[PDB]
Amino acid sequence: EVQVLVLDGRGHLLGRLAAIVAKQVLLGRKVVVVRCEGINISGNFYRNKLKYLAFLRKRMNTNPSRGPYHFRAPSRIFWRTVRGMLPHKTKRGQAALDRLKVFDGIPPPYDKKKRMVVPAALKVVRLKPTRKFAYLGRLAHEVGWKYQAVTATLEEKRKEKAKIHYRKKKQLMRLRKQAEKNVEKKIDKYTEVLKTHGLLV
Template sequence: MMVIDADNAVYGRLSTFVAKKLLEGEEVTILNADKVVVTGSRDFIINRFRERREIGSVRKGPYYPKTSREILRRSIGDMLPKKKTRGKEALHRCKVYSGFPEAFKGAQVVRVEKAMNRKVNGFVTLGEISRLLGQKV
């Protein structure tokens, strides 16, 4: 089982890393999904997530999530072959938490160096995005 601290990790890079690990058969748990970073212009990013949220209808979908942990889990799921059995099983092995639960205080936590954000400005966290999308606290 791999426990990943997603604090200051870039959204897409982290998602691809986790998707590959899941397809290899590993069980992955991601902590601090609120602190995952989406790089780019703040206004562009927020508008893009709002547009995704507004696509479709209430009855038919697609249903785009509001919470940071569900947004991250969906991006990982989009990188897996969900229509095939191995993709569905891989997504079941993925657990995402928005904070740092007490159960993982003593666990061996890994940071994905390839996915770390090195920018000082020009990014938005998933926590901010989810609050702007209307996440209930």
């Protein structure tokens, strides 16, 4: 467990991930969800786009400014899904909702942190390989989200930096495997203690 749970949204199903997140924020547990553009939704794209267009038709007739707010960003769509799964008209639910942060792409400071997945909501786990699915990024871009291209450009920049960091880790890890072989005589006895209790194989 961690103080702040940072969840990568890529490859996850919207409702399944929302149910897990909604429970966690109700149990304290500040949650941060990133890459909400990468969230998937079961069913073919056109069905899901129809669902969200049908959501746009729901406006107060007398005064649409007071009516339902249709949020286009993948972050806000996921945020609204979680809100539907919370008692958001009570102080407890509102406090729970404040514990959730949603982001499109991975903004700093969460881009330099380990991101965890929820296998109970992963598309590869929950959907048969032959079922169609929709990307929240493409769906949002076609219902009025303006920053699909900017996010995609910044995500490509972030991925360039993260590979330099990974190459450095592989270099460091190759050296640490070299280090163990050099000093194996000086750490032999300590290795046996780890092997005896299963800490090493």
